[PDB]
Amino acid sequence: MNIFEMLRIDEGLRLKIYKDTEGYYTIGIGHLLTKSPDLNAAKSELDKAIGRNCNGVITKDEAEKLFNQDVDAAVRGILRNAKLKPVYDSLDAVRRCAAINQVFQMGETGVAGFTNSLRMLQQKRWDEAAVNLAKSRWYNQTPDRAKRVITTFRTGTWDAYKN
Numbered sequence: 409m410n411i412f413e414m415l416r417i418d419e420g421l422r423l424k425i426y427k428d429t430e431g432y433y434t435i436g437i438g439h440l441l442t443k444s445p446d447l448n449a450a451k452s453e454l455d456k457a458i459g460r461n462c463n464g465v466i467t468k469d470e471a472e473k474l475f476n477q478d479v480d481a482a483v484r485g486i487l488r489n490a491k492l493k494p495v496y497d498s499l500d501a502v503r504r505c506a507a508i509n510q511v512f513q514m515g516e517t518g519v520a521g522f523t524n525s526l527r528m529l530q531q532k533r534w535d536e537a538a539v540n541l542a543k544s545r546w547y548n549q550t551p552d553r554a555k556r557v558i559t560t561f562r563t564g565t566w567d568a569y570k571n
């Protein structure tokens with residue numbers, strides 16, 4: 409297991425524009441196109457991202473290319489975020505994957521409400537952090553995925569994904 413395999417499980421792979429769990433136009437492996445309810449705006453974003461007229465459909469290679477870009481940008485974002493970087497750097501490699509996963513799903517804006525969880529993670533108070541992480545809109549809206557990510561934070565193992 410690694411971050412790509414982990415997010416591939418959590419996000420799936422769809423080659424046609426679809427709406428994510430929040431109702432937002434998305435494609436590939438959780439590549440958010442726009443929060444606009446306008447499908448045409450989503451198609452424009454898609455074409456811009458891929459560099460051709462896609463008419464709402466991409467290939468697996470194209471999906472994987474966006475995925476690589478998205479994972480990389482997520483990590484690089486964490487590293488330039490003064491609140492997230494010290495916590496991220498305090499973690500072992502497996503828990504770092506949980507951090508990347510959460511940011512990938514919620515964005516840095518989404519992680520802004522997790523100050524108390526972050527503190528517990530940096531303190532390596534794993535059970536306490538796990539309890540705190542679940543007290544969230546995130547948990548309640550996507551519980552099965554959040555449970556997997558939280559188990560990863562709690563244990564620093566891949567137990568929730570090796571299935």
Ligand SMILES: O/N=C\c1cccs1
Nearest residue numbers: 492495496507510519
């Ligand atoms: O927990 N979700 C995101 C992050 C944690 C620590 C650095 S990023």
